[PDB]
Amino acid sequence: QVQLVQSGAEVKKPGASVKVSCQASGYRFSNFVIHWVRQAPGQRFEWMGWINPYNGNKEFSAKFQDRVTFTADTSANTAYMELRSLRSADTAVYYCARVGPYSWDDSPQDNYYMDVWGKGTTVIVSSASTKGPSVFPLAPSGTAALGCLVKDYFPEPVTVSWNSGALTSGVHTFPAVLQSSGLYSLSSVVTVPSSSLGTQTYICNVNHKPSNTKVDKKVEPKSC
Amino acid sequence: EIVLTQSPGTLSLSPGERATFSCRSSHSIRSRRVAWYQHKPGQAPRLVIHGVSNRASGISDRFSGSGSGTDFTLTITRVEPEDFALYYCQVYGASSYTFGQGTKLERKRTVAAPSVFIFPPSDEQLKSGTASVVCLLNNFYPREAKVQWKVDNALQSGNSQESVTEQDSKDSTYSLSSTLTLSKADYEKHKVYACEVTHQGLRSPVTKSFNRGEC
């Protein structure tokens, strides 16, 4: 049961540093090198470097040669990665991964692929301050459509349900988009029978834990 | 300096078909240090193949890696529902760790035209300061779709953002929302708002619109 468990999501302002942890289990921690790799939205995975828990040996990608620090605590079977002087482009998911099993007959680093990956730790770098969303109705006009526009919040995520979870079929909650303002926005919609509009109540339940903002918005046909 | 280029960008297959992924390297990989990974949304990536042709642990024999020199292939003899995901190739070792851009293996189904809906900005949002116009394209396939916004017949370009849902695990369709952003001042300065949708399932483009003022 080789497993790697990472620390939780982080939100940092530009210029600050972040430290992510990777706790191993299911094997002898000191016997395997650990790789750190990240993936920013829309980009390819990017290797950052590796560390050998046993002797403390490390190799860094030229791009992170001076602002990343790799450390390991053989006592806790945990490896760490500290990234300093954060900038917006450092916004990404950071993964740790253990190399594969070794055999004396194998050539050096033949096993340096990413054998087992951690789930990743999200790190958001932005000057934006925590802010709850405004919730606006997307009023319904066969089959009708209605929804809620959840706008201007930070950071992700917000959760959206309909009728406290009683309504699930036909619901589509879209991925959020980052606006030029540095705040996020997303919509959640649901298609329903037009004949239900005067007898079925539709309420979108929005929750943005980072700001402790919860909103229940009833969406109804605009009495045009 | 090693650059890996994967193809195709997207593989559309139904269960039971064979999936073949290509990875072209700029430098011959005589070391055989080539790997393939599988990555599903919100889950840790998983190693599928290492050393060009060695299956990772717990990996079905349905997955096989091959190739040599500058061309490598990942093959899924027969695709299963659990296989739909992103697949990446990578070179590793000797200070060279670079990944391909990935190939998305998605599920093929019959063409489905989208149901289109347009939503004007709410009095609430307008009262609060700005305006968002939303166009929804519901349950369609394939993914390719074009949304064109027109305000008083003026073609809008660059002031809208699109978001698409992951392929539905039940009916294999996609849904998309496009949001047109404009100042409250500009919104009130115009009357006809419309979104024109082009899709393979539509004989001709479909347009949904409304007039700022009456419903």
Binding site: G56, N57, P108 | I2, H27, S28, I29, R30, R33, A94
Partner: peptide
């Protein structure tokens, strides 16, 4: 005669390992 050497596909030659 301390660190290990491996084949680099980028350089097409044998090189030394890193890390210390």
């Amino acid at each position: 005669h301390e660190r290990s050497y491996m084949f680099s596909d980028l350089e097409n030659r044998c090189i030394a390992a890193e890390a210390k």
